[PDB]
């Protein structure tokens, strides 16, 4: 089905390959496999430290599959240690260098919690405490906006921001965020935040869309009824809530399975059942940032 239309007129494919700091050589092969299968959207991040492997696999795949750059949607994310305005540009340029691209389709602020610049990706005490930094969200955003002005990035957005924090960005911005990426799945539907974000015109991407979920009885019943797999039901559930999904995998069979979600429809009763059976508990809490003023998950949503 059809790419989601964003508030700036551009479109984003409703499924993309999620990447992560997987064992060496796995991501490169995953990128190629995904693109062969039909994926046209890759979700990346500086912090996984594998954008160079991705960039190479990507460049070789476009060539062997005879695909054009503009046929693919590429997302990357600005990491917490580069949120100070004077560092944003170089971090983006670095990511683009590694990905071997001239521009990104989408660039997200990875978290609302800045970390000290100039060392490791997770600057840490000898108490094991994270070295926090203080940088207003609107100041980082101003630099993100310049990336759009300059053509280095087509659309900008947010990751792991809460309602309050998004409100503030929208109140100050010249260029609105086009996308919000947050944890969403049947065991954590994140309904209030999703409804809020869509109400102000953002598109919303579910990360960790499979979240044990694959084992839940109602999930299995519904998969059986439709003659699809559990993962396929879990993704369709999110797709029917008008979400983009970026399921992470480096296993060929899973990459392929995740993509076969466009030839059936969950009924209203099935949708409702999944919602009422939800746990619902946040899986990705990053508690080591919980001491920061802008830690996103203490507010209701």
Author numbering: 1 to 211, 221 to 310
Wording from the paper:
Aldose reductase (AR), an important component that may be involved in the schistosome antioxidant defense system, is predicted as a potential drug target. Although no research has shown that S. japonicum AR participates in the antioxidant pathway, in other organisms, AR is believed to be an important antioxidant component. Considering both these conclusions and the antioxidant requirement of schistosomes, it is reasonable to speculate that SjAR might also participate in the antioxidant pathway and protect the worms from host ROS attack. In addition to the above, AR has also been demonstrated to play an important role in aldehyde detoxification, steroid metabolism, energy supply, cellular proliferation, apoptosis and senescence. S. japonicum aldose reductase, an important enzyme involved in this system, was predicted as a potential drug target.
In this study, we firstly obtained the SjAR crystal structure through the X-ray diffraction method, on which a virtual screening and experimental validation strategy was applied to screen antischistosomal lead compounds. The rSjAR protein crystals diffracted to a resolution of 2.2 Å and belonged to the space group P21212 with the unit cell parameters a = 67.49, b = 91.00 and c = 54.67 Å. Residues 211–221 were disordered and were not built into the structure model. After structure solution and computational refinement, the final model of SjAR, validated using PROCHECK, had 92.5% of residues in the most favored regions of the Ramachandran plot and 7.5% of residues in the additionally allowed regions. By comparing the amino acid sequence with the homologous HsaAR protein, we found both the residues at the substrate-binding site (Asp43, Tyr48, Lys77 and His110) and at the predicted inhibitor-binding sites (Tyr48, His110 and Trp111) were conserved. These residues were located in the interior of the β-barrel, which provided a target area to begin docking. Compared with the known HsaAR-tolrestat complex structure, in the SjAR structure, Lys257 penetrated into the binding regions, while Gln297 and Trp20 were moved away. Additionally, Phe293 replaced Cys299 to participate in the formation of the hydrophobic pocket. Molecular docking analysis showed that AR9 located to the interior of the pocket composed of the residues Val47, Tyr48, Trp79, His110, Trp111, Phe122, Lys257 and Phe293. AR9 can bind with the residues Tyr48 and Lys257 through the established hydrogen bonds.
